[model samples]
Target chain A: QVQLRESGPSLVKPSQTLSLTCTASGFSLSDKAVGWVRQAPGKALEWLGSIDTGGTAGYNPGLKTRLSITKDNSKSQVSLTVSSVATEDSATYYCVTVYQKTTQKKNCPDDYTECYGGACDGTGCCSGSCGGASACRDWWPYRSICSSDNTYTYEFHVDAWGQGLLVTVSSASTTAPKVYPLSSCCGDKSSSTVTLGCLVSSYMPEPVTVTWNSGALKSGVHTFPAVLQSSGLYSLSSMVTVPGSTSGQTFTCNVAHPASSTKVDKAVEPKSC
Target chain B: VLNQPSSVSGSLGQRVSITCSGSSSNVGNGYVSWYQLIPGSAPRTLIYGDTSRASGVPDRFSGSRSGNTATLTISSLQAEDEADYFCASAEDSSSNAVFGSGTTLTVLGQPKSPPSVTLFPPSTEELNGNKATLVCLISDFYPGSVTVVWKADGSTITRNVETTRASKQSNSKYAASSYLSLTSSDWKSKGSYSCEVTHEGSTVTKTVKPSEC
Candidate 1:
């Protein structure tokens, strides 16, 4: 892991100037953007600005015209300068990085193109597809659909072997949706069989068996059996053998929790071997 | 008149506050200003409109504005600085000075005390016998407008020396430390040595007997 540190003069006189510096290790400045934030002795943090390893910079409008940030790749340090300082300008400065996007490694089985797409499908269901086909999953900007009768139920689970799952939901009016991690999926490279349990607040004290529909199953729809735990939670698991060559194919784990009007479904994709 | 006062006074470096209210003779323009006066020093405008500094005045002095009230603040006050601080308005410049209640300032307090004064070389104790260095230290001050002087027998000491300034710690308020180094064979003997610090309008002094050390 990369680490960053900051250093600078602790005190400044009124009408004079103040300066600070930031240094990072374990990562090259060339690979990331360095940003600065200002925290008044004991106040909330404020974005000061940032500079890329390439010497490009951006600043907060409030302090931009008066603030200057410079970096020395040779020294692995970034320097900051603020002129015409006043008592109000006193603060503790920090340096951080702006996250950049990168492509994830493919880990689906040869016979499990359907399983790979299941990882990104909004609905959680296990299905199989032809070889060499890639699926596009929408990871963010989720939409929440209520059941026809206005009662909605959704459940999520990890495989029996403890692979992880990711669930995202959203409502209108809110720009950013929330993402929920259902299981610890996506890291196992050598497992053949896995089972997962799930619980829904709306589904209480009911023992539901796993139901697999061939048509819905082919369309990636699934219903897993569930056992009611002593604490009013439901637990369930489903098993299916896709070709071993497709061992890394993702399996959608869907739960059927009780609803006010009808059964509702929520899905997650458990990571595979 | 209700707008006038008998008299106002303060010691140098000590701040004085005044309040002005609208009277029958004047409408409420709600303006106030403050100025400084030193016997031998030039009169500098410290604040305007309670919180704004007049042109050319250092930011060491500040003003704050409220609905109808203004406040002037001066930190680390110094001496050799004497002055009458007045709160006045633009509408009544002349009468403003008349209607104003001014604070007469008198410099008070001892000069700045040096944290440490040392003569280099632990072995040299006699004056005029060997070359010696005198070091003076003052810690934690703001505005960086401090004046320091070294005096021997009531007069300024002329000697070659180096000076350095460093900061100690800072939070909402800032603090600084400074160092002064002087070398001379004349300072090694029996004499009264002193370090004087002046800021704002107050003066503080620290004296040492070089003969004893």
Candidate 2:
């Protein structure tokens, strides 16, 4: 019967602050914590910030000064504010409930100051009744009653999710390309040839270049065109096949992107014997 | 649940076999499939339905099952055949999918060499932007087998790590890279980051401290 919904501005401008609210029901904000998560168009979900029942709030450190979380117990609602919105911040935001549980009945400390659970093997503090062998430590800052004797176990997870609200930041966009490590594998030792590949992803404008450091081995190289992804970004790959005597070898993949201030070069060598 | 050997290696032209073991409920009554994971490429299916090879897969690759165990055998091993192989099946209970731990197929007779490790600190501009990215460059290794581990101030940092597969270099050796991302504040506070590269039987660690921007 748990339910949650998010509402906020559908559009924001670069360097502006974004405000969103989460209205929750079938649960109370006084004893349970709520958190915010987001996903850029076609990207993986990212955890943003959360406020525990005890009013202690924590953020994803990377967003330290730019993010703020607030809640109102009377309205059973939580709010998120993100400042300095960038094109990368354009995403769908979701609000979720955080719940805790435990399985181990005996891992609590003697004084009951801390309890460890079997499910996650993580330490929690004793805020409520404890089972014989399982010690429930209050993993969070909550002092709420936790009833876990031999018959029951408590666990914490994102038990419920709210329908997401999409937010777009208005601005010209440029995403720097991420050049991955070069991968090299031998095709066949008998042929005395090896294949080297480089993958460049998560970029915009599609005008990136992938070049090799070896001056003489140009004919065996192939660079694929960038393909737009579902995440609103682009990716491409390049590979080279070269002959080698198998020692002291060095090859570099040099990447040039409009978003990058300098060239990125990733070098590769053979597996050590 | 399924269990597989950590690894299996064979010289060129020799037949190599990989075994996937599981319980009867999952393996005996369910369908089994085999997949090949090449570095930097999407996984390719080698077998499905426990014994059928996918279209265009080399004839030298074959699969068989025997009493709760599935086997993938490669005859006349070729260089293109080297890859990590995985076996998957469904459980009889919930019909949930299950996968083996995976087995790395190593084709022998290839020159095995070691890699030189290098650790690069974050740029001043990156730090100023409130983010830091550290790169570990591994070069001049052979056989293309290695692992990279990252730590901050001696404690392992498990998340936000990206590693590339070992790519062949011009000199015939293989090289790879690993990256670690941190907040600028955390980087400045911790002050020390280490990259540990393990290859063959040796592990080389390189540590970097904060330098003038």
Candidate 3:
């Protein structure tokens, strides 16, 4: 059996320093990753940083400024250091290993497309936080465009797998996009049946609004239902339907949140027979 | 001394009590130091809050702070494991090093913990016919709820018959256990097998050889 033991002083005076260590047995420190965590006397745990036996390390971007770790694979041991001890730092500390494999598998089919446009590349707002070219390519296999540009009187569909749809628009663009849902994504005619589901991250607490253009369709508002999770994360989903026959028409999925710097909009083309 | 608060609030040079069990005289000649204890590994001494190295102590490890609480802070916590920590003090008058209990820290749970596996027979003689049973066990869990997986050779056995149980130990510690069964024919020869257990945010693993069963 592999065993890990932690040892350190229990008490620290205010403005005083605090430290600790973790000793592991039955495993090679050189072959695995080790990390540290901090928990106040009775509070939740926080990420500190991690180090491998070779001394390679990574820290939580938030706490990376104040943490360090070292390891000796020969002895199968690791060391941690946190500076400027404070009352808020009075927490239980632990050392652990970082393993590099996962079992959960996800694949987005070719019929669906999810774009993670980089910093509105054409808009010149270039902050560059988008998933970048790699992220766009990774999400490309999941991308699906409308079969044809029908009329403003008809609705189109975009089948997306996973939680949310990421859309980007260039400030230079004039026409806003719209998205519609049918019962299914079957049939080759301009007006076919398809169903689309959209959801947003619960960290975004505000409501998302969907608007339709083409004067023929009436504009209606809907709220995504929020579900409380055991881990305290919230979730919600919404669905909308559009006229299948409207050629050259567009639909939009608009998400408005208080914390978001800008709204997210996704455009889908109506099917053309 | 027990009446004193475990930690005080203040800046450097502020008054803080470093309460030592027994008497002050016993801790007087000793140099107080602190260290951080991260999960899954060993500890590193941070502040030697005083003088004298036990031998090859590094200069980066220093001591300085105010009053009863001696502070030991290492600049630039180089890695994630540096997050879990504890304070310590070595007595000049005595041979023993006084250590504060232990604290399990939380760091970004990535490259997570591997599933730990425990073999049932723990010996090689148990192999029989086309069917054999090996029990994999993982314990000392937090945030409960875990999944156990079994693998033969390099391929995963998707149809594993598994069950989980959660129980409280005599020491008030919470633990969870899982069971996995496989065919004995899969264990023929000296091939290696592994049991992986995944928890809320962590994973542990163990491996064994059928020949060494």
Lowest summed lDDT window (length 10), candidate 2 chain B? B90-99
Q: What does candidate 1's lDDT look like per residue over A1-273, in tens digits? A: 456666654445566666777777887877766766554532333456667666877666557788888888888887778877775676555566642112122324443333333344332212243233344333343222211221221111100010101111111111111111122223422244332212222143232323333224442212232333343333333333233334344444333322112242334345232
Model 1 off-target regions past 4 Å?
Answer: A5-273, B1-131, B140-144, B158-168, B171-180
> Which portions of model 3 show Cα errors greater than 4 Å?
A100-106, A110-273, B1-213
Task: Give the Cα error of residue B30 in candidate 2, in Å.
Answer: 5.4
lDDT of 3 by residue, B104-156 (tens): 33222223233323334221222333444454444345433577777767567
Q: Per-residue lDDT tens digits of candidate 2, residues B1-213?
A: 378887889988999889989876666643567777654343466876668887678889899989789899999987677677878665532113455777777777877777766565554445566866675667778767898889888888888777777665445457677767678887788757889998887998878776422
How well does model 2 score by local distance difference test? 0.67
* Backbone clashes counted, model 3: 95
Which is the leading candidate under TM-score? 2
Most accurate candidate by DockQ? 2
Q: Regarding DockQ, does 2 or 3 come out ahead?
A: 2
- Mind giving the per-residue lDDT tens digits that candidate 1 earns over B114-197? 232121111132123343434333333443345667677788755543334322222111122222233455555537666676
Superposing every Cα of model 2 onto the true structure, what RMSD results?
A: 20.6
- Which of the two candidates, 1 or 2, achieves a greater TM-score against the reference? 2
Clash counts for all predictions: 40, 45, 95
Per-candidate chain B TM: 0.36, 0.61, 0.39
